[PDB]
Structure 1
């Protein structure tokens, strides 16, 4: 537990997690790309919405 180490009044905005990815991962593999996921079939070309 790290309640008194990281937890900051207001919350920690520096800790991120990947909720969306195009395909499943491989063991010991890291992904840092911030490309906008094409959730819909409509291509966004890097435009959020």
Structure 2
């Protein structure tokens, strides 16, 4: 249930919250909001056991 932002274009500022669930472009190719090669979701969950 606990997720972190693995990927973002720039570092955040102090006391700023980012909740935008938009795709990140990790490569030269645009991703157009759809996952695929070199296009990953920014939010990943922790494996707490």
Q: TM-score, normalised by structure 1?
A: 0.69
Q: Which has the higher contact order (CA 8 A, sep 6+)?
A: 2
CA distance in 1 between partners of 2:34 and 2:24 (Å): 10
How many matched pairs?
36
1:5-49 CA deviation, whole Å, 9 max, x = no partner? xxxxxxxxx100001011110000000001110001100110101
Higher strand proportion (structure 1 or 2) = 2
Stretches (4+) displaced over 3 A? none
Gaps (5+ residues) in structure 1?
1-13
CA RMSD of aligned residues (A): 0.6
CA radius of gyration, larger in: 1
Q: TM-score, normalised by structure 2?
A: 0.69
